[PDB]
A paper describes a structure:
FXII circulates in the blood as an 80-kDa single-chain polypeptide zymogen with no detectable enzymatic activity. The FXII Arg353–Val354 peptide bond is cleaved by kallikrein, generating α-FXIIa, which has a heavy chain of 50 kDa, connected to a light chain of 28 kDa by the Cys340–Cys467 disulfide bridge. Subsequent cleavage of α-FXIIa results in loss of the heavy chain and generation of the isolated protease domain termed β-FXIIa, which contains only a nine amino acid peptide heavy chain remnant disulfide bonded to the protease domain. Here, we describe the first crystal structures of the FXII protease domain, which reveals a zymogen-like conformation.
FXIIc is a protein-engineered zymogen-like construct with two additional residues present at the N-terminus, resulting from the cloning strategy, that effectively block the native N-terminal residue Val354. We term this the zymogen-like construct, as it is similar to the result of protein engineering of the N-terminus of FXa to induce zymogenicity. FXIIc crystallized more readily than FXIIac under a range of conditions for both glycosylated and deglycosylated samples at 19 °C. Data were collected to 2.1-Å resolution for the deglycosylated FXIIc sample, and Fig.2D shows the electron density in the region of the active site residue Ser195. In a second crystal form of the deglycosylated light chain, the S1 pocket loops are ordered, and a short α-helix in the 180-loop of the structure results in an enlarged and distorted S1 pocket with a buried conformation of Asp189, which is critical for P1 Arg substrate recognition. In FXIIc, Arg73 extends its side chain guanidinium group from the 70-loop of the N-terminal β-barrel to form a direct salt bridge with the buried Asp194 side chain. The Arg73 side chain from the 70-loop is stabilized by a number of interactions with the 140-loop, resulting in encirclement of the Arg73 guanidinium group and the formation of hydrogen bonds via the side chain of Gln151. In HGFA, the 140-loop forms a hairpin-like structure folded up against the side of the C-terminal β-barrel, interacting with the 180-loop close to the entrance of the S1 pocket. This folded-up 140-loop conformation is commonly observed in activated proteases, and contrasts with FXIIc, in which the 140-loop extends away from the body of the C-terminal β-barrel. All residues that contact the inhibitor in HGFA are in different positions in FXIIc, by virtue of the concerted coiling of residues 189–194 into the FXII S1 α-helix. In the current study, we report the first crystal structures of the FXII protease domain light chain. Both FXIIac and protein-engineered zymogen-like construct FXIIc structures reveal the conformational hallmarks of a zymogen, owing to the lack of an oxyanion hole, a disordered (FXIIac) or helical (FXIIc) 180-loop, and an extended 140-loop.
Author numbering: 359 to 599
């Protein structure tokens, strides 16, 4: 598998000094977490960079886009984080174009929903994660971890995430194994085996919440993209029908 062109769908989202990642699901659409947008920033103050290697760093294949509008799931809860997803409609330029697809910028495929994930499913989470403030020249690189899907039964254990796990959420990671809580970003991609899909890997999770960087790792909790599949289709459709 490739490495600088490793996760060409991952988007870097900026507002003020806050940060979130998301996933390019088509040239004009990015999928992220609703919690990233719950304070309702003006679309004009958002910046999306596709193809970025280091946060805050410009780069030759980096593409910077404005956002035209965005939609949070109408039922998102800021308290429990149930239904933690949003769509960004990117601003098209003079030509009707949004992301210029390239070897560094490519959309990720949505799950089929045919494929019901199991503890044997293999996944990957990408993100930048924790980085010490100051000294930009030392900005971290995108990194990735291989994580297994973690059953609802094991995730809802009192000892793991308890009654905090709600329908529409899924878990991935190791019970004690470690190292994802310091490397994922709110809204970032969990990409897993679909097999019943044209592509080998599809986007099956959006980084939602989990244990704090620094504490002992728990599995991360992700928005279960497949559960919202009709919501994502309906709000991206090209034509009213």
């Amino acid at each position: 598998v490739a490495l600088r062109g490793a996760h060409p769908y991952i988007a870097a989202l900026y507002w003020g000094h806050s940060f979130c990642a998301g996933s390019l699901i088509a040239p004009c659409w990015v999928l992220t977490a609703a919690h990233c947008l719950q304070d309702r920033p003006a679309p004009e103050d958002l910046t999306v960079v596709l193809g970025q290697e280091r946060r805050n760093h410009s780069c030759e294949p980096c593409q910077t886009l404005a956002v035209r509008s965005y939609r949070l799931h109408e039922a998102f809860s800021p308290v429990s984080y149930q239904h933690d997803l949003a769509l960004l409609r990117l601003q098209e330029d003079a030509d009707g174009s949004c992301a210029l697809l390239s070897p560094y910028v490519q959309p990720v495929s949505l799950p089929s929903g045919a494929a019901r994930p199991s503890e044997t499913t293999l996944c990957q989470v990408a993100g930048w994660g924790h980085q010490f403030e100051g000294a930009e020249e030392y900005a971290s690189f995108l990194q990735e971890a291989q994580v297994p899907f973690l059953s609802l039964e094991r995730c809802s254990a009192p000892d793991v995430h308890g009654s905090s796990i709600l329908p529409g959420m899924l878990c991935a990671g190791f019970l004690e194994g470690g190292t994802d809580a310091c490397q994922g970003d709110s809204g970032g991609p969990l990409v897993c085996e679909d097999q019943a899909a044209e592509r080998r890997l599809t986007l099956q999770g959006i980084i939602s919440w989990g244990s704090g960087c620094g504490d002992r790792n728990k599995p991360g909790v992700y928005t279960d993209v497949a559960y919202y599949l009709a919501w994502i289709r309906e709000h991206t459709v090209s034509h009213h029908t």
